Amino acid sequence: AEEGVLEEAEFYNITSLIKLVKDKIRERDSKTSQVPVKHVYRVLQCQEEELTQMVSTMSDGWKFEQLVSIGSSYNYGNEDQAEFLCVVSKELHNTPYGTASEPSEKAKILQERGSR
Amino acid sequence: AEEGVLEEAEFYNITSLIKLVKDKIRERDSKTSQVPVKHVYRVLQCQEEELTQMVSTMSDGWKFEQLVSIGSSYNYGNEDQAEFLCVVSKELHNTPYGTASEPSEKAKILQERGSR
Amino acid sequence: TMDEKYVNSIWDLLKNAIQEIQRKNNSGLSFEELYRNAYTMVLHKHGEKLYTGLREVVTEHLINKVREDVLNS
Amino acid sequence: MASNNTASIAQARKLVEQLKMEANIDRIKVSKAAADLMAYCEAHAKEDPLLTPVPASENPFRE
Amino acid sequence: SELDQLRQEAEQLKNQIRDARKACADATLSQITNNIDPVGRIQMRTRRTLRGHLAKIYAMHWGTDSRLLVSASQDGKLIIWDSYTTNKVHAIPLRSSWVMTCAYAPSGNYVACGGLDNICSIYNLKTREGNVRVSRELAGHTGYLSCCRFLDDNQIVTSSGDTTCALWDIETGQQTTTFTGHTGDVMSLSLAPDTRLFVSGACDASAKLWDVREGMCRQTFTGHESDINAICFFPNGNAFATGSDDATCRLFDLRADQELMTYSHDNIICGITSVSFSKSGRLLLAGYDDFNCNVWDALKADRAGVLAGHDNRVSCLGVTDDGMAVATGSWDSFLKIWN
Amino acid sequence: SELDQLRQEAEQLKNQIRDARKACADATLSQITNNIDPVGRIQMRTRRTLRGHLAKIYAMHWGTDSRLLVSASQDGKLIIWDSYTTNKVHAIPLRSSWVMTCAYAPSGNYVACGGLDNICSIYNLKTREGNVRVSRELAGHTGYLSCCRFLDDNQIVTSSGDTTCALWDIETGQQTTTFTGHTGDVMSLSLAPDTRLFVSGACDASAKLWDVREGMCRQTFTGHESDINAICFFPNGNAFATGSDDATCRLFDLRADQELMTYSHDNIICGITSVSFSKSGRLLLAGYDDFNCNVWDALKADRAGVLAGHDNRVSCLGVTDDGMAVATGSWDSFLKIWN
């Protein structure tokens, strides 16, 4: 367990060693994002013409997970702007807490502004 | 371990050695695409009768991921000239070195020309 | 890039390690550490400082180790 | 230095060569080739499916 | 020094070849003679529309079994169409994107392709496991593969990027005979029906015709000043049409070693992006950076007709290997077959 | 201790900047001459509607070629639109949501992202595969990115939180020019067409026009009572329009070292959330936290007209670099092309 190595680093409280084992645990969590740790998700919106393009030009690391059609008021199907949602994912590293996910005041101000 | 081999290579100097060992690690991690996480995705436009063909006659080294129908305006919404998108994928390194960027300017010209 | 706040400590440690090697000591020194030290202290365009320190330290090794043993016997 | 110049003497040498055997290539008169192509085109002027359309029950592209 | 003397020798040889061409020059009989009669205006129809593409068709390529045509899409998919039934006999997901070169074997035993990945893909079509498994990934090409052509089922000519055209052995994965004569990026190619003489068009605007087994050029037809988009041999291999990106196609004869007549028009100003002959070769098929293409009388350089109905440039053309129909593989993401 | 004498020095220095400014302060001939180039009430059509996003358009940036445009949605996605044809040239997922700034490179080959990740994301648009993959992850900002601009394809200015607007080397990922002059959160940014001066707006309401060549605050234009939302240089690059969270815009001139004139109505109380200035340098385009936006005849100091049709607050503006049309990326997930 890299967690055990991190605990041993804590016992000798070597900060560089702490950082290194936490980097190892982050690499683990990115590689083990399906073990419940950080895992990022998004949805793109495209129609078929751009759909092929950005499926083909999908980023290295982001994995396609699902496509879906959305009801098209034009004709019955294709060639409507609302054509396909594209839910994609990426196995993202989980950073051990105490060093990450630390908010800021103006960031929260803007978050409240954009929430509505 | 990647860290042990990386440090043992750095102990033997040369920057070319460092780059080549990094590329070897990226090869052994990117052929299965884990940490480099390198995956290729394609959209095959196949209609219904053809379907079982390229599903059965898929290219080896690939893996089917999703099939989605298309709204159609001919033959009761079934059997259009575009009737299904078969989103297929495969996990492997595009390059085991993780290389990018080409020095050929004519290739860039053609890429921009086909972009619009 | 260009900033002198950290270069002094790593520089003196690196020169001390170079002398230790000159003093026939690698049983306590890791080549990877010294190699990384030289690399980070180079790539920040401090290579003139290494060229100077290298020149003076090889001259110092010749005087302090080579010349003494040449003359003493 | 233009006596080696990163072996540009080599590419100049090959250019001289290619021009030499291009001059060595026997020219065949323009009207001669024109008559030859006239003969071939006319000999194949009524067997070209593109010069006389194939009915779309007679072509493999409408079967 | 040596460079100056060699350059002067080259210049005087150029002058000598110019003089030899001028002596060889004659009044072109085809254009002068109206007894052969203009081909007239042919009302030409699409028999098949290979709809099912939705990426741009970069460069199509008719099959050499004369029924199954490979099309290369911009997104990195290879569609082996059955032209006769509008049925895709195969879709290959291509690990490379931005692919232009699709090459069909004389048998369909193998298919080859190349894009900007700099690796020549050779897929064994008829694997007895009933799938399309890659056979050989040829590595060692300098730049992007510009245009491939199957001449052997174990060797293939691969016009590569950045001034390279090396023929490649499939089984070793090694090149067979490098071609290093071009100064511009070797980005067009054409094989004679003789299948021994390939004329490659590059950005140097000079169509270099090489023999396959010489491993060294034989002719350099320079009648164009713009990069040579496409080259199509005459159905006899005694001449070829070459389309460069100004407005102009040119007919170069191998016996006269010079351009015969020119195909430059003021009714259309776009550079001729693709060229092809008829079965007889009397009809010139000029694919344009214009959304449409045209057909001219190659003997008279007058317009036989206009092939329109697209919305984007005809980015490739193909005629049947024996010849009964012409497929326009355009960037509008489908192919129009005209017969 | 000694901070008192420096504080008094700066205090009387500010006194005499104010004195020099008001001595330089004259009545604008622009407000006096209202009959010169009047626009009346100008109304323009939304003729293209880039509706592809699904979240709030946080802040869009035009392309240097003035055909493409990067639009960052509130959810953490980029839509590199082709404005001329309404096709999403790219759609890119972002590993951090709440991304507010997307930046488009001079080359058009890189894109920059700034959200709350405290990392500048540089995605190469064109790689050897033709896909859009991350090129660089500029990490090391103490605060969070709020705006960014591509100084070049290897140097980028990142107006980030925690009093930083540091230049970053793209290739080495190393911070280049540290700025520590601000006291508020550096959250607005604007790059001159001269490209030699970047004016950063922050929560300290101080438009710090920094010199990009030496990284020292060339001027600190002040006069706004709120954090500076957006800044947009004059087309000559000799001045910049500034819109803070107050209900007024201002025009700060470097030659006069003072604000030439303000742009405020009692008709609006909303903070000026985006400023963008016409190609001729006449019309100032003010985005508002109200449902609409406005065009001011800034050389007449009055409202040229109101552009309405977005049902939510238009949270970003961008004029075409040919100066004939504008994109209004609102928070209604709809981007409209007003022309």
Swiss-Prot record, chains A, B:
This is BTB/POZ domain-containing protein KCTD5. Residues 96-116 are annotated as: Disordered. Homopentamer. Interacts (via C-terminus) with GRASP55/GORASP2. Interacts with CUL3 and with ubiquitinated proteins. Interacts with CRY1. The gene is KCTD5. It is found in: Cytoplasm, Cytosol; Cytoplasm; Nucleus. Induction: Up-regulated in peripheral blood lymphocytes stimulated through the T-cell receptor. The BTB (POZ) domain is atypical and mediates the formation of a homopentamer instead of a homotetramer. Residues 103-116 have a biased composition (Basic and acidic residues).
Swiss-Prot record, chain C:
Brain, spermatozoa, and testis (at protein level). Widely expressed. Neddylated. Attachment of NEDD8 is required for the E3 ubiquitin-protein ligase activity of the BCR complex. Deneddylated via its interaction with the COP9 signalosome (CSN) complex. It is found in: Nucleus; Golgi apparatus; Cell projection, Cilium, Flagellum; Cytoplasm, Cytoskeleton, Spindle. It comes from the Eukaryota. Forms neddylation-dependent homodimers. Component of multiple BCR (BTB-CUL3-RBX1) E3 ubiquitin-protein ligase complexes formed of CUL3, RBX1 and a variable BTB domain-containing protein acting as both, adapter to cullin and substrate recognition subunit. The BCR complex may be active as a heterodimeric complex, in which NEDD8, covalently attached to one CUL3 molecule, binds to the C-terminus of a second CUL3 molecule. Interacts with RBX1, RNF7, CYCE and TIP120A/CAND1. Part of the BCR(SPOP) containing SPOP, and of BCR containing homodimeric SPOPL or the heterodimer formed by SPOP and SPOPL. High-glucose conditions in renal tubular epithelial cells lead to up-regulation of CUL3 expression, significant increase in CUL3-mediated ubiquitination of MRPL12 and dysregulation of mitochondrial biosynthesis. Belongs to the cullin family. This is Cullin-3. It comes from Homo sapiens. The chain holds residues 24 to 96 of 768 of the full protein.
Swiss-Prot record, chain D:
It is a lipid-anchor. One of its GO terms (biological process) is cellular response to prostaglandin E stimulus. The keyword Cell membrane applies. The keyword Metal-binding does not apply. It is found in: Cell membrane. The modification N-acetylalanine is found at residue 2. One of its GO terms (molecular function) is G-protein beta-subunit binding. Pfam families: G-gamma. It comes from the Eukaryota. SUPFAM superfamilies: Transducin (heterotrimeric G protein), gamma chain. Expressed in fetal tissues, including testis, adrenal gland, brain, white blood cells and brain. Keywords: Acetylation, Cell membrane, Host-virus interaction, Lipoprotein, Membrane, Methylation, Prenylation, Transducer. GO terms for cellular component: extracellular exosome; heterotrimeric G-protein complex; membrane; plasma membrane; synapse. Guanine nucleotide-binding proteins (G proteins) are involved as a modulator or transducer in various transmembrane signaling systems. The beta and gamma chains are required for the GTPase activity, for replacement of GDP by GTP, and for G protein-effector interaction. Belongs to the G protein gamma family. This is Guanine nucleotide-binding protein G(I)/G(S)/G(O) subunit gamma-2. It comes from Homo sapiens. The lineage of its organism: Eukaryota, Metazoa, Chordata, Craniata, Vertebrata. The gene is GNG2.
UniProtKB/Swiss-Prot annotation, chains E, F:
Pfam families: WD40_Gbeta. One of its GO terms (cellular component) is plasma membrane. Keywords: Acetylation, Disease variant, Host-virus interaction, Intellectual disability, Phosphoprotein, Repeat, Transducer, WD repeat. One of its GO terms (biological process) is cellular response to catecholamine stimulus. Changing residue 91 to T: In MRD42; decreases receptor-driven G protein activation; increases trimer formation with alpha and gamma subunits; no effect on protein abundance; no effect on complex formation with gamma subunit. SUPFAM superfamilies: WD40 repeat-like. WD repeats lie at residues 45-93, 94-139, 140-180, 181-222, 223-266, 267-308, 309-339. The modification Phosphohistidine is found at residue 265. One of its GO terms (molecular function) is GTPase binding. Changing residue 63 to V: In MRD42; decreases receptor-driven G protein activation; decreases protein abundance; decreases complex formation with gamma subunit; decreases trimer formation with alpha and gamma subunit. The modification N-acetylserine is found at residue 1. It is linked to Intellectual developmental disorder, autosomal dominant 42: A disorder characterized by significantly below average general intellectual functioning associated with impairments in adaptive behavior and manifested during the developmental period. MRD42 patients manifest global developmental delay commonly accompanied by hypotonia, seizures of various types, ophthalmological manifestations, and poor growth. This is Guanine nucleotide-binding protein G(I)/G(S)/G(T) subunit beta-1. The lineage of its organism: Eukaryota, Metazoa, Chordata, Craniata, Vertebrata.
